[PDB]
Design an enzyme around this catalytic site. Structure first.
Site, PDB file in Angstrom:
ATOM      1  N   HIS A 136       0.891  -1.129   0.206  1.00 20.13           N
ATOM      2  CA  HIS A 136      -0.060   0.137  -0.165  1.00 20.13           C
ATOM      3  C   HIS A 136       0.798   1.395   0.062  1.00 20.13           C
ATOM      4  O   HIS A 136       0.408   2.487  -0.129  1.00 20.13           O
ATOM      5  CB  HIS A 136      -1.129  -0.100   1.137  1.00 20.13           C
ATOM      6  CG  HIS A 136      -2.268   0.639   1.041  1.00 20.13           C
ATOM      7  ND1 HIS A 136      -2.516   1.801   1.729  1.00 20.13           N
ATOM      8  CD2 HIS A 136      -3.300   0.504   0.112  1.00 20.13           C
ATOM      9  CE1 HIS A 136      -3.670   2.255   1.312  1.00 20.13           C
ATOM     10  NE2 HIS A 136      -4.093   1.623   0.282  1.00 20.13           N
TER      11      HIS A 136
ATOM     12  N   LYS B  45       3.071   4.253  -1.029  1.00 21.67           N
ATOM     13  CA  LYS B  45       3.097   5.343  -2.463  1.00 21.67           C
ATOM     14  C   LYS B  45       4.006   6.319  -2.091  1.00 21.67           C
ATOM     15  O   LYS B  45       3.915   7.293  -1.233  1.00 21.67           O
ATOM     16  CB  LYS B  45       1.685   5.842  -2.403  1.00 21.67           C
ATOM     17  CG  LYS B  45       0.571   4.721  -2.683  1.00 21.67           C
ATOM     18  CD  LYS B  45      -0.659   5.449  -2.436  1.00 21.67           C
ATOM     19  CE  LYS B  45      -1.142   5.023  -1.272  1.00 21.67           C
ATOM     20  NZ  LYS B  45      -1.733   3.686  -0.994  1.00 21.67           N
TER      21      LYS B  45
ATOM     22  N   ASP C  73      16.062  11.511  -8.352  1.00 25.19           N
ATOM     23  CA  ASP C  73      17.344  11.976  -8.242  1.00 25.19           C
ATOM     24  C   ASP C  73      18.142  11.803  -6.832  1.00 25.19           C
ATOM     25  O   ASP C  73      19.270  12.211  -6.409  1.00 25.19           O
ATOM     26  CB  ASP C  73      17.802  13.100  -8.800  1.00 25.19           C
ATOM     27  CG  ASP C  73      17.339  13.449 -10.221  1.00 25.19           C
ATOM     28  OD1 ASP C  73      17.688  12.626 -10.885  1.00 25.19           O
ATOM     29  OD2 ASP C  73      16.601  14.553 -10.540  1.00 25.19           O
TER      30      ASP C  73
ATOM     31  N   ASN D 202      -2.306   7.501  -5.605  1.00 29.28           N
ATOM     32  CA  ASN D 202      -1.947   6.224  -6.241  1.00 29.28           C
ATOM     33  C   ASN D 202      -1.569   6.509  -7.762  1.00 29.28           C
ATOM     34  O   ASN D 202      -1.510   8.021  -8.016  1.00 29.28           O
ATOM     35  CB  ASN D 202      -2.998   5.208  -6.239  1.00 29.28           C
ATOM     36  CG  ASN D 202      -3.208   4.552  -5.131  1.00 29.28           C
ATOM     37  OD1 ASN D 202      -2.354   3.866  -4.617  1.00 29.28           O
ATOM     38  ND2 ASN D 202      -4.345   4.879  -4.419  1.00 29.28           N
TER      39      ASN D 202
ATOM     40  N   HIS E 293      -9.069  10.890   0.503  1.00 29.72           N
ATOM     41  CA  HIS E 293      -7.777   9.967   0.603  1.00 29.72           C
ATOM     42  C   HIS E 293      -6.757  10.354   1.656  1.00 29.72           C
ATOM     43  O   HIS E 293      -5.863   9.462   1.945  1.00 29.72           O
ATOM     44  CB  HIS E 293      -7.341   9.530  -0.707  1.00 29.72           C
ATOM     45  CG  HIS E 293      -7.818   8.315  -1.366  1.00 29.72           C
ATOM     46  ND1 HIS E 293      -7.969   7.045  -0.957  1.00 29.72           N
ATOM     47  CD2 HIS E 293      -8.581   8.141  -2.656  1.00 29.72           C
ATOM     48  CE1 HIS E 293      -8.587   6.166  -1.664  1.00 29.72           C
ATOM     49  NE2 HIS E 293      -8.743   7.032  -2.836  1.00 29.72           N
TER      50      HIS E 293
ATOM     51  N   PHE F 191      -0.401  -2.071   9.737  1.00 24.87           N
ATOM     52  CA  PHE F 191       0.664  -2.310  10.777  1.00 24.87           C
ATOM     53  C   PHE F 191       1.309  -3.255  11.077  1.00 24.87           C
ATOM     54  O   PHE F 191       2.369  -3.459  11.550  1.00 24.87           O
ATOM     55  CB  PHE F 191       0.435  -1.178  11.856  1.00 24.87           C
ATOM     56  CG  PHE F 191      -0.264   0.106  11.868  1.00 24.87           C
ATOM     57  CD1 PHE F 191       0.442   1.319  11.504  1.00 24.87           C
ATOM     58  CD2 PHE F 191      -1.655   0.113  11.659  1.00 24.87           C
ATOM     59  CE1 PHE F 191       0.094   2.530  11.319  1.00 24.87           C
ATOM     60  CE2 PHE F 191      -2.155   1.453  11.450  1.00 24.87           C
ATOM     61  CZ  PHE F 191      -1.549   2.767  11.182  1.00 24.87           C
TER      62      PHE F 191
END
Ligand SMILES: *[C@@H]1O[C@H](CO)[C@@H](O[C@@H]2O[C@H](CO)[C@@H](O[C@@H]3O[C@H](CO[C@H]4O[C@H](CO)[C@@H](O)[C@H](O)[C@@H]4O)[C@@H](O)[C@H](O[C@H]4O[C@H](CO)[C@@H](O)[C@H](O)[C@@H]4O)[C@@H]3O)[C@H](O)[C@H]2NC(C)=O)[C@H](O)[C@H]1NC(C)=O
Ligand SMILES: *[C@@H]1O[C@H](CO)[C@@H](O[C@@H]2O[C@H](CO)[C@@H](O[C@@H]3O[C@H](CO[C@H]4O[C@H](CO)[C@@H](O)[C@H](O)[C@@H]4O)[C@@H](O)[C@H](O[C@H]4O[C@H](CO)[C@@H](O)[C@H](O)[C@@H]4O)[C@@H]3O)[C@H](O)[C@H]2NC(C)=O)[C@H](O)[C@H]1NC(C)=O
Ligand SMILES: *[C@@H]1O[C@H](CO)[C@@H](O[C@@H]2O[C@H](CO)[C@@H](O[C@@H]3O[C@H](CO)[C@@H](O)[C@H](O)[C@@H]3O)[C@H](O)[C@H]2NC(C)=O)[C@H](O)[C@H]1NC(C)=O
Ligand SMILES: *[C@@H]1O[C@H](CO)[C@@H](O[C@@H]2O[C@H](CO)[C@@H](O[C@@H]3O[C@H](CO)[C@@H](O)[C@H](O)[C@@H]3O)[C@H](O)[C@H]2NC(C)=O)[C@H](O)[C@H]1NC(C)=O
Ligand SMILES: *[C@@H]1O[C@H](CO)[C@@H](O[C@@H]2O[C@H](CO)[C@@H](O)[C@H](O)[C@H]2NC(C)=O)[C@H](O)[C@H]1NC(C)=O
Ligand SMILES: *[C@@H]1O[C@H](CO)[C@@H](O[C@@H]2O[C@H](CO)[C@@H](O)[C@H](O)[C@H]2NC(C)=O)[C@H](O)[C@H]1NC(C)=O
Ligand SMILES: CC(=O)N[C@@H]1[C@@H](O)[C@H](O)[C@@H](CO)O[C@H]1O
Ligand SMILES: CC(=O)N[C@@H]1[C@@H](O)[C@H](O)[C@@H](CO)O[C@H]1O
Ligand SMILES: *[C@@H]1O[C@H](CO)[C@@H](O)[C@H](O)[C@H]1NC(C)=O
Ligand SMILES: *[C@@H]1O[C@H](CO)[C@@H](O)[C@H](O)[C@H]1NC(C)=O
EC number: 3.1.16.1
Lengths: 419, 419
Positions: free
Chosen positions: A128, A130, A135, A145, A343, A365
């Site tokens: 999950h 993201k 660089d 997402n 979200h 978790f």
């Protein structure tokens, strides 16, 4: 340890769905698409992406909405990095079904490297997390997402930290764990090697210069199987913020269940539930909970929220308020699947800032991968004040309703509201 | 260990206040005064009493109610044991103020031995335990204080276990601890000697013959400072019953606070609160809570009860019901101080029986003394069925009300009901 002298600058980026208007035009934060396009334009060395799934164009959604241009533009730019010599490495959770990956195959022929990570076998969860690493200097951490709906249809919130080489390099080690596990036949080692170990934990966070003002920051990951010795577990970091709060706690998370979801028989999980109850009773901390409700929200989540909002009266001297954030949706927006929801997953206190990529259920978790950024700063202002102003904008908004509101009143189809 | 062959017989004794009538005249249990008078009549060797306070006559209450005759009769009989050679030993919590002890001095000149135990210094609590030991053969364990109001004005519940020499002797060792601490200048030893040690704990309860049918029983005491190595702590025994329940949990306790009361700053104490939530969610256990409300009930107790009754709906598949037991009081009964309340403190499951002398707050298992009896029996019937029938009589009674009832409706002055 050693301090970081990089001129780290933190920008709060959020995506506002079409139709959502806030009259208090005072925050003014850049959109996720604007930040992503700027990040891709300046990429010249490497780009590491950890994603849940890739639905960046209308083909995968099987729709014809004209709101996917921003999502398609990101994909178009992503196909040009590999020709220029940028090492693109993408870690994506392996889909449960046989869903074709039109976007991932498009990047594969361009020159990028894509690896699918079987979380359902290693930790019996999903990936999950993201985040981006550009660089090894600028990283984006948030809930967005790789959707065209995550840029124009849903409401999100993330942080882009510019020019922070020391902090981005710490995020790379988390990505290195997923890259190692993405290899076919690779299992979780009993102890991670030093390569994935970190020295900036909760006990000794690193010192940076956030817009000049010194600050302390450290990254917390999940699940524990993947956390090395020096990495603070996400639950421990989350509970430390709740334990150290003395004035208020502001929480805006999509889903809040004190239960290990999916795992049956129903397992109780009063880890974060007990922390909030201790804060309001033992201390004079005011707790405000902003939960998101949509058609796919778990209906069992209401009972655990009513059991939390009940602890608020003069006698007990506690203050817990729970509100539901419902994104309105018309007929055109309703036709898009998984398109109208809030979200954001973050917590704000009077002294600490928490920005995470995982919901507040029990599996995020212990089984599900995730990463959260914890930044504390002395003095008023800074990142914490900007994040606090965002929460108050959402709290005092027509799109936020109490738990006793009729379900017809809200614009969407909320499953947590009676009648 | 070794089984007990004594023909142990257990009788449930409860005191019904004047004016409380149950139309379902089917239980028929002896009153506390009848059991106490029978116990005193048959005493010929020894009598050990652990009490909270002694208000057995109208003089201490400074009243002229004719309902104190039963209380005075018990005191009259207690003054005749010492002349006959019965070794009377009484442990009483030392009063905070300079309250004269008219009853205790009356027994002191008769020949009894009275020792005051300074719980406020040893464990910073009080001696809330209430039990008798007659000839080391019959013992009474219950919530009844040495009040004339505990026999005719308040509603209580206790158990008199006849002809159980092995079990009464175990209760004596608990009394021996209070007797040792009652000595002036005696402090709690780091480790108790073998004399106070017991071998019938939760892991290995003793085997008795309850009305012929074999059963397992063991005594649990508090606070831990006083519990020897072989004694099961009261909280551990209480939580074991909740954890092992599979069908239902019936709880009737005067006060239920998941907080360490008195201790400031307000300390949260989600020990029993978490056990009940786990039972209804993880298992299909139905939990029914019967709490007593009067003028001196803590008003903060409502918020923690509404937070528990909120977890009951189809989605969550949980079943928690909370009801308030209010003893009606007219003007004559209102003039008597601390006179109209339900004092029962016990828990009933589908397989185990718990009878205790302490409330379900945080201090009664860590600082305040107390003792509970845990009896399990195979097959239907026995003590558990009789206790279950008592709870259902109280639950489906006009004196038990929901948490949303108006406070005027009930007969007494309930502080837990709004308006
Ligand atoms: C630490 O340092 C960083 C780096 O400078 C700061 O990040 C800057 O934060 C400010 C404030 O949030 C940003 O400025 C704002 O940008 C918004 C979005 O930018 C786009 O806006 C439109 C959207 O269509 C585009 O046309 C435009 O070209 C931009 O690409 C603007 O919308 C904001 O203006 C609006 O709000 C303000 C009030 O907030 C109004 O007064 C305006 O009239 C307008 O309505 C605003 O300009 C800035 O872009 C960020 N920098 C970078 C590089 O991203 C951190 O804020 C700083 N930390 C602290 C605590 O100060
Ligand atoms: C294990 O073994 C023990 C020992 O025998 C049993 O204990 C007996 O339990 C029964 C049932 O509870 C007791 O019998 C009942 O006694 C009640 C109180 O006794 C007094 O009642 C009046 C009150 O004024 C006095 O006048 C009288 O002299 C007694 O002193 C009675 O009230 C009961 O009768 C009423 O209820 C029954 C229905 O329950 C009605 O049918 C009657 O008509 C009447 O309304 C009843 O007689 C008995 O006293 C207990 N024995 C002892 C020694 O105390 C345990 O019950 C047993 N365990 C199991 C599981 O069976
Ligand atoms: C992260 O660090 C880089 C490196 O310093 C920052 O880029 C620098 O940004 C400044 C501010 O715009 C640039 O200065 C400008 O230069 C132009 C000439 O090119 C001048 O006309 C302007 O008036 C202004 O002085 C600087 O050139 C630029 N340097 C490089 C190498 O790009 C960057 O801004 C930092 N990140 C963030 C979010 O600020
Ligand atoms: C605890 O154990 C004692 C000892 O056995 C029990 O006392 C006994 O009780 C029985 C039942 O009433 C008595 O039997 C009766 O004897 C009289 C003659 O005295 C007779 O007329 C009756 O018909 C009946 O048979 C027995 O005498 C008595 N024994 C003693 C020594 O007192 C006692 O009942 C037990 N406790 C409980 C609660 O049952
Ligand atoms: C706690 O006490 C405060 C102060 O009395 C309450 O706030 C006001 O209470 C009065 C009457 O008690 C009401 O008429 C006002 O409408 C209340 N104002 C607000 C802004 O609430 C408060 O209601 C009490 N309860 C809680 C949970 O705070
Ligand atoms: C759980 O579901 C049961 C069964 O549907 C509910 O029981 C009945 O529900 C119908 C409509 O849902 C009501 O009209 C009846 O009055 C209910 N009967 C009883 C005895 O409650 C029940 O209400 C649902 N909720 C809970 C908390 O059990
Ligand atoms: C998978 C798919 O639909 N591919 C289409 C192709 O069929 C069509 O010929 C071309 C020209 O519009 O566009 C693309
Ligand atoms: C303490 C007290 O009131 N004691 C009284 C006493 O004064 C009185 O003389 C006696 C005769 O009724 O009864 C008793
Ligand atoms: C799918 O992608 C193709 C080419 O990338 C193009 O036709 C269009 O963008 C999408 N839709 C359909 C129907 O092909
Ligand atoms: C107090 O006790 C005495 C003697 O025990 C007797 O007068 C009565 O029972 C009580 N009341 C008063 C007023 O004395």
């Amino acid at each position: 340890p050693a301090p970081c002298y990089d001129p780290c600058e933190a920008v709060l980026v959020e995506s506002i769905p079409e139709g959502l208007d806030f009259p208090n035009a005072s925050t003014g934060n850049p959109s996720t698409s604007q930040a992503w396009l700027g990040l891709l334009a300046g990429a010249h060395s490497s780009l590491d992406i950890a994603s849940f799934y890739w639905t960046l164009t209308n083909n995968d959604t099987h729709t014809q909405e004209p709101s996917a241009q921003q999502g398609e533009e990101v994909l178009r730019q992503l196909q040009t990095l590999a020709p220029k010599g940028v090492n693109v490495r993408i870690a994506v959770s392996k889909p449960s079904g046989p869903q074709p990956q039109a976007d991932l195959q498009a990047l594969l022929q361009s020159g990028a490297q894509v690896r699918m990570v079987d979380m359902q076998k290693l930790t019996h969860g999903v990936l999950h997390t993201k985040f981006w690493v550009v660089d090894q200097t600028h990283f984006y951490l948030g809930s967005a997402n790789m959707d065209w709906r995550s840029l124009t249809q849903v409401k999100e919130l993330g942080v882009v930290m510019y020019n922070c080489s020391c902090l981005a390099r710490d995020l790379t080690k988390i990505f290195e764990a997923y890259w190692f596990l993405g290899q076919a036949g690779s299992s979780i080692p009993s102890t991670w090697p030093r390569f994935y170990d970190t020295r900036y934990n909760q006990e000794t966070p690193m010192e940076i210069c956030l817009n000049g003002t010194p600050a302390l920051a450290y990254l917390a990951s999940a699940p524990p199987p993947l956390c090395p010795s020096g990495r603070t577990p996400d639950l421990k970091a989350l509970l430390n913020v709740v334990d150290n709060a003395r004035s208020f706690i502001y929480v805006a998370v999509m889903n809040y269940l004190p239960t290990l979801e999916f795992s049956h028989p129903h397992r109780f999980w009063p880890a974060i539930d007990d922390g909030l109850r201790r804060a309001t009773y033992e201390r004079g901390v005011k707790v405000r909970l902003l939960i998101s409700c949509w058609g796919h929200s778990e209906p069992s989540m209401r009972a655990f929220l009513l059991s939390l909002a009940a602890l608020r009266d003069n006698h007990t001297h506690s203050d817990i308020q729970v509100k539901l954030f419902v994104v309105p949706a018309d007929e055109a927006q309703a036709r898009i699947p998984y398109a109208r929801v809030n979200h954001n997953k973050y917590m704000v206190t009077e002294r600490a800032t928490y920005i995470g990529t995982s919901n507040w259920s029990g599996n995020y978790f212990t089984e599900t991968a995730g990463t959260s950024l914890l930044v504390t700063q002395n003095g008023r202002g800074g990142l914490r004040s900007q994040l606090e102003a965002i929460f108050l904008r959402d709290w005092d908004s027509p799109y936020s309703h109490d738990l006793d509101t009729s379900a017809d009143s809200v614009g969407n189809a909320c499953r947590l509201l009676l009648e």
